[PDB]
Structure formats: structure tokens, C-alpha cells
């Protein structure tokens, strides 16, 4: 028997001590080795309730990622609280590794095995575990990258559906790759991302239909972000240490939801040295990008959406890409987990 509680978690990883890659280095000092024989007990005839939007596991992961980035990605210039801090800014090796979050003695993690569980409500199917699955700390906006897929159906996630101020997480049940490349050889900050139109539009169509199920079969329309910082209006992520900003206009194409637009989709991108820190602490300036082919291939496994408020007589609903938290990224991976206290 068990009871709901919050406590300080620890982390585990398979980080290599000889590796200079910053996630490896951090985890070597801040985390323990993984368990090769992890226990998982299915809780027979037990129903447990979850709430991904009120889950202290999420807040704790954010702290770690903030801490990781702060000691690993020193900029040449940092603009924070009106102050400027300078230090050395060598190019680094950067590639996220899976991190498991685990409970200490007297506590355990409950896992919801409901395939179509939406992150809020009751879960009949529950298994206890010592540690979560390995979650890569991928920091991004609009699109969730290299993250777990829905087992069965596409799931729409939101703290409240009726409310428009609450971010919507679309959990994909099938990956779509992103290939971003800064070619070796003009403009060293010029880049692009290639996506498969046929595959993506098939998925996007399904997401539209899924959304229809939740909004009284109203018409679903995608539009580009109304405004804001470049970090949210564009697809923002970190690739091999370089901060990428990718235009997503082409990805949310209404007319393709079909003509011969089944070919490769190429998003225009730029690498920026001066950025707004996702930590919310201000602005940082980095050195210009390394030479040669900068390339990251990533699955698209989630989408962040904001719905337009004020629909009236018109039955349409408009959605725009971009989430309003980095915590939501971790939320999407931790939605099926919660900490409880053992009696």
C-alpha cells in the first residue's frame, strides 16, 4: 500500500567518464550509473489517478536542465538582470543523453500504462518502478524532438481544453524526422531543414482529425504564430552546440491538409549567436558556428499548440505552433509518472 507524496529525486545515466560531451560530463558528477536489472511490478486490480500538469517531477527535471546548461554552455557574453558576465566560450561537444529520474527509499514511482491516457484523470493500468525511462533533455519550442511516442492513438494534452491560455501538447504516435544541415560550403549562419511532405502531411491530417474529436467536429485551421520572440515564433533547438532558429510556416500548411505537395519540405533556418535564454534570465552571445557540415537528425514526436480565443458564431478553431514553457517539454515525457510515499 502507498500514498501520494513529493520528495527530492535523484538521477541516473549511462554517461561515459572519458567523454567530454557536456551531458556526459554533468551526469558523471551529478548522476549515478543506471540499474541493469530494474524491477517493475504490475499492481493487480489497482486504479491510480494522475495529473501531469500538477507533478513535482516536472519542476525538478527543469532545475537539473537549467543547472546543466549553466555550467556547460557558457556564452562569451551573458546579459542577465541588467548585468553582463564574460568568460571563455570554447566550442563544445553537445548531444543529449537519456536521463532516468528515480525515487529514494520510502518512496516509489507509479507508472500509468493506459495507452490512450491523456495526462489527466484516472488510470486503471498501473505499474510501479524505481526509475523512469531514459529521457533526453531536449530543449526546444513548437516541436518536441527525440521524445517518446504514443503507444496507440494520437493524444491531445492540455491542462484545460476549454481554456485558451493553456498550452496544448500533441503527442505523436509515429515519428517524423527532422534533418537540419548547415552545409560546409557564403553565409556561415545559413541553414535549412528537410522534412518529407508525404509522410508529414499524412500525420498532420490525423492530428487535425484528432483535434476535431475534442472540439465538437469544428473546422481546424493552422496559422503561423501571432508574434513574440524568435525563440517561439521559429522552431528553436540546440544542435551540436549551435543555436538554431527554424521557420515552420511550411510545416503547418492548411491547403495541404491534397495536391502534388507531397515532396520534400525545406524550412529556411538561421544560426544565431545572440539569443534569448530559455531559462528566462536574459540574453547570451556565443562565438560564430564551427566550419563544416553541422547536422542533426531528429524525430518529431510532439507538437505544442496555442488555440485562438474568442471564437463566436463562426465554428472554426485556429491553432498556432509554440509552447509557453520548457517545463512542458519534460511534462510530455513525465506525464505517466508520479511520486508516492510507501507506508
Amino acid at each position, epitope marked *: 500500500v502507498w500514498k501520494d507524496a513529493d520528495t527530492t529525486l535523484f538521477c541516473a545515466s549511462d554517461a561515459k567518464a572519458h567523454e567530454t560531451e557536456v551531458h556526459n560530463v554533468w551526469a558523471t558528477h551529478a548522476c549515478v550509473p543506471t540499474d541493469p536489472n530494474p524491477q517493475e511490478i504490475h499492481l493487480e486490480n489497482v486504479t491510480e489517478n494522475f495529473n501531469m500538469w500538477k507533478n513535482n517531477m516536472v519542476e525538478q527535471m527543469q532545475e537539473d536542465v537549467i543547472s546543466l546548461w549553466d555550467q556547460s554552455l557558457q556564452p562569451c557574453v551573458k546579459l542577465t538582470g541588467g548585468s553582463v558576465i564574460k568568460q571563455a566560450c570554447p566550442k563544445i561537444s553537445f548531444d543529449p543523453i537519456p536521463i532516468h529520474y528515480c525515487t529514494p527509499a520510502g518512496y516509489v514511482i507509479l507508472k500509468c500504462n493506459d495507452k490512450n491516457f491523456n495526462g489527466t484523470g484516472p488510470c486503471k493500468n498501473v505499474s510501479s518502478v524505481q526509475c523512469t525511462h531514459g529521457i533526453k533533455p531536449v530543449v526546444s519550442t513548437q516541436l518536441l524532438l527525440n521524445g517518446s511516442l504514443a503507444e496507440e492513438e494520437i493524444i491531445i494534452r492540455s491542462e484545460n481544453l476549454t481554456n*485558451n*491560455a493553456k498550452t496544448i501538447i500533441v503527442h505523436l504516435n509515429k515519428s517524423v524526422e527532422i534533418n537540419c544541415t548547415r552545409p560546409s560550403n557564403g553565409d556561415i549562419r545559413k541553414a535549412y531543414c528537410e522534412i518529407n511532405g508525404t509522410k508529414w502531411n499524412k500525420v498532420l491530417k490525423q492530428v487535425t482529425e484528432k483535434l476535431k474529436e475534442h*472540439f465538437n467536429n469544428k473546422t481546424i485551421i493552422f496559422q503561423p504564430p*501571432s508574434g513574440g520572440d524568435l525563440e517561439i515564433t521559429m522552431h528553436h533547438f540546440n544542435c551540436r552546440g549551435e543555436f538554431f532558429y527554424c521557420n515552420t510556416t511550411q510545416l503547418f500548411n492548411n491547403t495541404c491538409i491534397m495536391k502534388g505537395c507531397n515532396g520534400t519540405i525545406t524550412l529556411p533556418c538561421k544560426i544565431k549567436q545572440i539569443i534569448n535564454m530559455w531559462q528566462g534570465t536574459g540574453q547570451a552571445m556565443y562565438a560564430p558556428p564551427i566550419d563544416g557540415k553541422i547536422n542533426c537528425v531528429s524525430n518529431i514526436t510532439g507538437i505544442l499548440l496555442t488555440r485562438d*480565443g*474568442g471564437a463566436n458564431n463562426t465554428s472554426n478553431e485556429t491553432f498556432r505552433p509554440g509552447g509557453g514553457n520548457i517545463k512542458d517539454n519534460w511534462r510530455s515525457e513525465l506525464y505517466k509518472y508520479k511520486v508516492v510515499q510507501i507506508e
Partner: antibody
């Protein structure tokens, strides 16, 4: 006390644009969404949109889309709403708005209002 | 997709009397609602939130209730200072407004 203090009443000529400011104090500017609402003379309240201070995220209703622009200044805790292509029917009282309650953006605290008069 | 309708459009009552304002929600499903007081040539003031919870600094005579479609704002004993326009609210939607008027 949570407080929003907006700029004084403005006078513009049709076709021109206006920029309205909202100075926040008494709370963490970053913590909650900022909304804008307009009141026609002898009329009800109309929601114009909301803005997120940390990343500048913006939401607009169908009617004000393309006609309204919301901007933020994090360093001075001041929010802005810019209205363009001003019309005679844009003459109204505009309010910058924020939420007193934690975790609930919708409950609101009202700024004293900024009257915008559009005349040639 | 939710619309708020207030009744009555105008409400005329004597001092010391109980006053009730009705707000109806089209969507049919809600648990949260706010009420506001607005005096002439003055900004609105939050009175009630979460349907039945009083804002700080608001007199005890003010109460809120209601479930589902219908919500009500009640004044236990009307005071001359309460004469103003009152609005209800659900998310981005407001009611048309009711003007409390001193009856003669």
C-alpha cells in the same frame, strides 16, 4: 498591491497608429499573462488579447487580428499594446490587464484605463 | 465557444434591499466565474471569483453562487455605494452588464 498604470489619453487622426503602455508593479511581472480590453462609450467590455511576459507569446481574437500588436519590455516591467489603422469606432477606453490569482490567468486586475480619441 | 448572458439589463432597487443579478452560460459546463463592479468614469473592480469566493476588501454583503449554466450575484443589503454597472465573466467572455439604479 498588484498595480497596472497606463499612459494618458491619446489623440490621433484616422489612418494613424497609437501605442499604449502598461506599467506593472507590486508583483512579479514575469509570473502572469497580460491582457488588453476595450470599452466602447456607454457599452460593454471586449477582450482584445493576452501576452506572456517571459517569451512574448501572444493570443488574439478573430476581430483584432492584423489590427493589434502587443509587445513587452521585461527589463522595465512595462507592457505595450499597439493599435494601427485607427478608425472612428476605435474611440474607446483601453485597459491593460493581469491576473491577481496564481495559476489562473483569467481572474483580472484592472488598470485605470486609457482613453483613445480618433478624430481628424 | 462560450457566451455569457446577463439579466436583467437594468436593475432598480431601494437601499437596504437584497439585489440579485443572473448570468447564464451557453456552453452549459463551468465551475469558475468572476463578477466585477464598475462605477461611472472609473475602472472595473473585481468582487467575486471562482463563482462563490469574495475578493479581499469587499463587503460581506456581496455573495456569489450558481452551478452549470446559471450563476448569480447577490447583495445582502443594498448600500448607496454599490450603485454601479456589474459584469460577469467566463474566460475571454463578458456579460453585457447590469446597471444597478436607486429606485424612486
Amino acid at each position: 498591491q498588484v498595480q497596472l498604470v497606463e499612459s494618458g489619453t491619446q489623440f490621433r487622426r484616422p489612418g494613424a497608429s497609437v501605442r499604449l503602455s502598461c506599467e506593472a508593479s507590486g508583483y512579479t511581472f514575469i509570473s502572469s499573462f497580460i491582457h488588453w480590453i476595450r470599452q466602447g462609450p456607454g457599452q460593454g467590455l471586449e477582450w482584445m488579447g493576452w501576452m506572456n511576459p517571459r517569451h512574448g507569446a501572444v493570443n488574439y481574437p478573430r476581430r483584432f487580428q492584423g489590427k493589434v500588436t502587443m509587445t513587452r519590455d521585461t527589463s522595465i516591467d512595462t507592457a505595450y499594446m499597439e493599435l494601427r489603422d485607427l478608425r472612428s469606432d476605435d474611440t474607446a477606453m483601453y485597459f491593460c490587464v493581469t491576473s491577481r490569482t496564481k495559476d489562473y490567468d483569467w481572474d483580472f486586475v484592472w488598470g485605470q484605463g486609457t482613453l483613445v480619441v480618433v478624430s481628424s | 465557444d462560450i457566451q455569457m448572458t446577463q439579466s436583467p439589463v437594468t436593475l432598480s432597487a431601494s437601499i437596504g434591499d437584497r439585489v440579485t443579478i443572473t448570468c447564464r452560460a451557453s456552453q452549459r459546463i463551468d465551475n469558475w466565474v468572476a463578477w466585477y463592479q464598475q462605477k461611472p468614469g472609473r475602472a472595473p473592480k473585481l468582487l467575486i471569483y471562482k463563482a462563490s469566493i469574495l475578493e479581499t476588501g469587499v463587503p460581506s454583503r456581496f455573495s456569489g453562487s450558481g452551478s452549470g449554466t446559471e450563476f448569480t450575484l447577490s447583495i445582502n443589503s443594498l448600500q448607496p455605494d454599490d450603485v454601479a454597472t456589474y459584469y460577469c465573466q467566463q474566460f475571454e467572455e463578458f456579460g453585457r452588464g447590469t446597471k444597478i439604479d436607486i429606485k424612486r
